[PDB]
Amino acid sequence: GSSGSSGNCRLFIGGIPKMKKREEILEEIAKVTEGVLDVIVYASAADKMKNRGFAFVEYESHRAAAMARRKLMPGRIQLWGHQIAVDWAEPEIDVDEDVMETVSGPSSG
């Protein structure tokens, strides 16, 4: 079960208040970064359950996320006055082997 799960693209957004919900985060992101499809939150049927201060941002365009992080990487943009940081979600994809001609459907080789 090697690691990879090469597919969609999500940005690691850490350093945000729990008072906010995936609903708010998405918006605050739709401005700081253009190209966001949707935002996901990790928590037990409740964002303010484990006191987690982070959120996931899925970008339709694999790049939309790569170029969206370089904008918040330096921490130039803050959310609700709170500092935020962007990190590469995927730990290790299958780019080493296949990084070009990204295809989502091996149906026909």
Nearest-angstrom CA–CA distance, 90 and 76:
23
Q: Which two tokens stand for residue 38?
A: 């949707």
The contacts of residue 20 (CB under 8 Å, 6+ apart) are 28, 79, 80
> To which H or E segment does residue 31 belong?
helix 22-32
Nearest-angstrom CA–CA distance, 55 and 12:
7
CATH of domain 8-90: 3.30.70.330
The domain limits of the chain are 8-90
DSSP 66-80: HHHHTTTTT--S-BT
Nearest-angstrom CA–CA distance, 91 and 4:
8
8 Å CB contact between 80 and 47: no
